Amino acid sequence: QLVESGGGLVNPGGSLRLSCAASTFSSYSMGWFRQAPGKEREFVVAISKGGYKYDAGRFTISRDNAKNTVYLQINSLRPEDTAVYYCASSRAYGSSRLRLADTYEYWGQGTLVTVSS
Ligand SMILES: [Zn+2]
Ligand SMILES: [Zn+2]
Known part of the structure; x- marks a missing residue:
């Protein structure tokens, strides 16, 4: 039900x-989560x-x-930012549990962001 878009090659x-x-x-x-190479x-x-x-x-x-639509703005990219970025939706009201993946029920496919130069 969710589709992320906008990933691509970007400069530090x-x-x-x-x-x-x-x-x-x-x-x-x-919520937005990300999975970088190596990292969990x-x-x-x-x-x-x-x-x-x-x-x-x-x-x-x-x-x-x-x-x-929900938008993620990344301002001043860094090599740590190379990752697949995932969008997720939760039925929960706001709390710090929105920082945990287990709280979310629906997820997108991910969009890849590659920081390069
Ligand atoms: Zn508008
Ligand atoms: Zn804050």
């Missing part, structure tokens, strides 16, 4: 906007149903309910 120090389009979006808290999964950032954000300050989140 650059900026990148990813989008996660949802197929009743307003009733879900939305990392929480990135989440925005609750109510509009409140939970952070892991280069990664920011907005939700356009009227476009059924």
Whole structure:
């Protein structure tokens, strides 16, 4: 029900906007996670149903309910940022449990971001 878009080749120090389009979006808290080469999964950032954000300050989140979309902005890319980025939706209200993958029920396919130069 979720599709991430926008990944690609990007420069260190650059900026990148990813989008996660949802197929009743307003009733879900939305989170972004990432899996880098080697690393295990990392929480990135989440925005609750109510509009409140939970952070892991280069990664920011907005939700356009009227476009059924959540955006991840990465400002000032770093080599650590090479990863597949996953969007996820949870039926939970906002809490620090939105930093945990186990809280989410629906997930996207991921979009790959490669920091290079
Ligand atoms: Zn914060
Ligand atoms: Zn809009």
